[PDB]
Amino acid sequence: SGELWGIHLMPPRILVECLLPNGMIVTLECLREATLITIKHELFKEARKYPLHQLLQDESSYIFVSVTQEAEREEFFDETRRLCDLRLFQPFLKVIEPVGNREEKILNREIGFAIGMPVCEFDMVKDPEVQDFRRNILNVCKEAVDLRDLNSPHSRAMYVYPPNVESSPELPKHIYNKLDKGQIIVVIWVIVSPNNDKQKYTLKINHDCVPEQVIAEAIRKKTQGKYILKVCGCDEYFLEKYPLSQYKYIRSCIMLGRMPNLMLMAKESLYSQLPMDCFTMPSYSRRSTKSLWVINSALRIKILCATYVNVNIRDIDKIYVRTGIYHGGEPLCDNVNTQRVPCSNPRWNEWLNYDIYIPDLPRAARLCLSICSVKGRKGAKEEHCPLAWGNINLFDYTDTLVSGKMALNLWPVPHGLEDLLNPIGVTGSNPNKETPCLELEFDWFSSVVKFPDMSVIEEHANWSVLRENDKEQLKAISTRDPLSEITEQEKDFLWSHRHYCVTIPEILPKLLLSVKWNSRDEVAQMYCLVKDWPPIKPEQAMELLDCNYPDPMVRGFAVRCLEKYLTDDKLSQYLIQLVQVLKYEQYLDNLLVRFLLKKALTNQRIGHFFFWHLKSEMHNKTVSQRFGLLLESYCRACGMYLKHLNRQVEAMEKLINLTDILKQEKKDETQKVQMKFLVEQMRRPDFMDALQGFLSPLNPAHQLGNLRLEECRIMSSAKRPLWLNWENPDIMSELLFQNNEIIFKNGDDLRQDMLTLQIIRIMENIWQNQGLDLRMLPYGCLSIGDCVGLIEVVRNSHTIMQIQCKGGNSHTLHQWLKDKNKGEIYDAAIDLFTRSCAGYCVATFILGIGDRHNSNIMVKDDGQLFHIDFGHFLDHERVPFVLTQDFLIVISKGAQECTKTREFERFQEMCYKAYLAIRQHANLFINLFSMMLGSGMPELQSFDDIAYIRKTLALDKTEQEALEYFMKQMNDAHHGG
Amino acid sequence: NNNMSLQDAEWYWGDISREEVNEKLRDTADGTFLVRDASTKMHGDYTLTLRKGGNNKLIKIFHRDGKYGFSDPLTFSSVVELINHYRNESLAQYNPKLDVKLLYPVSKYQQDQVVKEDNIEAVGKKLHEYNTQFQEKSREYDRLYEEYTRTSQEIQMKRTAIEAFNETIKIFEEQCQTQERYSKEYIEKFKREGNEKEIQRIMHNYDKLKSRISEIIDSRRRLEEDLKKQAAEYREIDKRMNSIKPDLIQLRKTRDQYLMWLTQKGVRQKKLNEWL
């Protein structure tokens, strides 16, 4: 890989052969940075030394085409690009008369570099659904772009600098008390024209004051239509009208006891930075039926030859095809098999019969199947093992029941999955065509069968169709967790009392599970109820989107609750999960993707993470096409952000290439030689040019400036991560921080760590909102590719191992805290170490994260404690308490009798209050995990794994029995306490 | 005679979580059932899990005033008699849309007469040797997985190279074909004037072009056979994984039976911690 195939190192001058229009072969020696304009110039001033000159007649009117490494021909209109970064497959060039718009395919080169694959590939896809999505999804792009031009340049700013507000104007009491009589003191900085000198204006104002009046009254002390407020350091602006305490930055300062100093910026200065956005529609945008219910027949499917299966003709006896109709994860009928045949001639000319009628098929029905190998040996044993799987929708996106022949390319069996079928799997054929293939054939009903429209369904309902004293059982069921067991009596009880459920709106997830989906009579009655159901909270309607509920009307109802209730603050929180439930969607054009895309194109904070969450999963061949089509739609209409996303992508590739060389080819050298390699590679003009002056993927508001090569070392741990240091471009960097450190890790999966840190942030939010101040530290983590990711760095922190080594024992840690902060502040250090140490004892236990030790547990000089390197969770009641003697001494302030101290018993008091607080919101934590089953994480592959959290929260027991379960675990792990 | 104690019942399994019951009813015939203590851990609940229609039906047993039953009238003295009553008559009585007769119980005694070396030392010794086989066999599969995945990437990388070669060849050959097209009118005039250089020089570029075209096609030709060797070696790794996988299930299934069996017969797992 590299600038040319095979050899990544690029000699400055290379013999490049041109293909002139006449037919003359010419070679040129150029530079790596020799732009296309110069090469054509020198190229044309050498045809004079060649036979035929009568056709050229000039240098313009040419496009300078060549062939790229992705195996696609590029017309190279953008003559500015240096030959170095052309990614040419082979050194050779051709000259043609320009063809095309040159504007739609100067863009198609930037779109296809961020997505990681050429845009021309979607044109060769002949799927009618793939091409209907590319054209119809442009309606949302227009509306989103139009909405960005409604009122003023102001609407343009709100897109680029979205107010980072919270969804709670009312403040928790415990923080409100931090204000002295409900007032907060802020510092305002004004830049003065002479030499650009700074002024400081200390200021005292009420917490619930809009930014407008904060600015105006700040002017009085100076002694309107301009001067928007800004956050010193990062790029955050107070544009929208919210109480000053509403914003995330302001609220945190109150909690952490910091001085919220801001900046005053001329309004037209911000508007000038705003670029004009022009969304031009792409070229492609311009380019007998009998109802299902009148087919009195049973479902029938015919299997035919399977092209090839990789088996050994001796270790395996016979093979068969296992099928079954599924609706979600549950069978609609009994699974059927085919006769065993030798694994040499997989023919199977069978007509499988299913126990379900055609009219009863639900809209979201699917046909899962697999090729299994039966051993049938060991005297009295017969063990089955799947060899490949594949699912097929029974209705295409147009509502048409499939029919006729069909060839399906099967998928590999997922690692660690042992069941025969994979109903939790992407419907569709394997893109790779050199895999096992299975020919099917669906019988023909002398027509195209279309699923009945809603009007027909609504009539079937309301055609075949007071209060109760023991309705406390309905309330009993409503409060049960999503994974709780529902019995045949409860299912038969909910359905019979369905009409009185609408007075308990949160009963829907249970009432939908107690309905027979292979019975159009019941299903047609559920549609008439879901149509008039009251709205439910987004945190409950967000569990109607996981794999258990595939019906388009149920999933459509959930997305109408997200639209009218999900605030932009919570969408940014649960986005990692809403992206994952895009893989459960039946078809390419959903109602969820239209909602997600519109938010991305209207809020550039969601857009940045929307892009990287989709872009980090393009290596999956199972969802590369679905996500690739979505990334193209976003990149097309995202505005000018595509130029910023191209610098981040280019910067991350330079680091991946650099790290691969270190950890792949010459890993076995000493660190000094490895260290000297890094400096020479990082000192090159191109590397230094690509790795500077771009936004950071972790926080788009933090812009990374000059690279401080002196303190960019190679970590000695893990896989040799990269510790990188940057600088704040803006003048007022000292008020926020001077350097952005970042660990670039390439080699270990970061999506286990990025979901653990999302759960920790939600816990800490629950505890703070309730009454508690357990201060946790959920630093930043982002996976940008296949086992490559970025990690923030916490300033001024030492691992417990570091403090012990430099401390000489068990009193070393407590002495170290004493040394750093002596005096009246010592109490806060012991108070903060205790609140933080209590939260991480509860969070670690509930999630069962990998075992902690002295190397992956850190403490700030202030006293706060936090954990790092959350290797695995849920796997590897079976996890003791991480607490030990070193931390106990700190809790009790050095007293030798630690267990029986007043301080320690206060520590236990907020460990219980914390555990009981999370146990009340176990519904939220069961969904966050339940929406990631298809995520591919090794330890979260099935609903069985989510049962660990149902056990550490004692969800089945009573509130009192659960508390005893925690106390037993707490004391037992510590051998008493 | 028939209504023996619930403890001495083949189908009764005690306190096993729902996850364990699922693994024991998975892909079983219609009509399989077993009984266990309710998940809430309260005394005298006895949930009944039945496998009908591909799904695991889950019917609860109510115990009031020393009587048992599904619906309100608990006209049954004990669980064993209630099971045997419905073990001979279909459940269509209790539920019209539930037609199964509790045919194939999942007996816990069947698992008993498959184990050997019931003593405390042989179990640990035999169990210890399986673990050696399990770890070495399990690691064997994992190492192959690395070759299978690393091999897959190389195949895809080569395939894209072939497409690039095809495009390069078409560009080169088209230029050659364009050579004659443009060398049709000027050729006649060039021939009339006896200029050796123009004929030789034009052929000089054409002669070089043929070498480039031929050289490129050789590169694609050789690379294709490299892919075929990779593709062949790729399928072979697939064959080994498929023939190894059932061994892992068989070894792990039997291996865990003994580890679970050691606890059942009053043996603490602390000693088994060092046996491994």
Ligand SMILES: CCNC(=O)[C@@H](Cc1ccc(C#Cc2ccc3nccnc3c2)cc1)NC(=O)c1ccc2nc(C)c(C)nc2c1
């Ligand atoms: C005896 C010689 N020294 C070593 O052998 C190890 C010891 C050692 C290992 C590992 C962490 C750590 C950590 C860490 C990891 C994940 C985190 N995630 C969130 C927040 N903080 C985190 C902190 C500390 C210390 N030195 C390094 O490898 C190393 C490399 C580059 C550095 N460059 C700078 C700029 C600075 C300040 N120190 C550097 C330390």
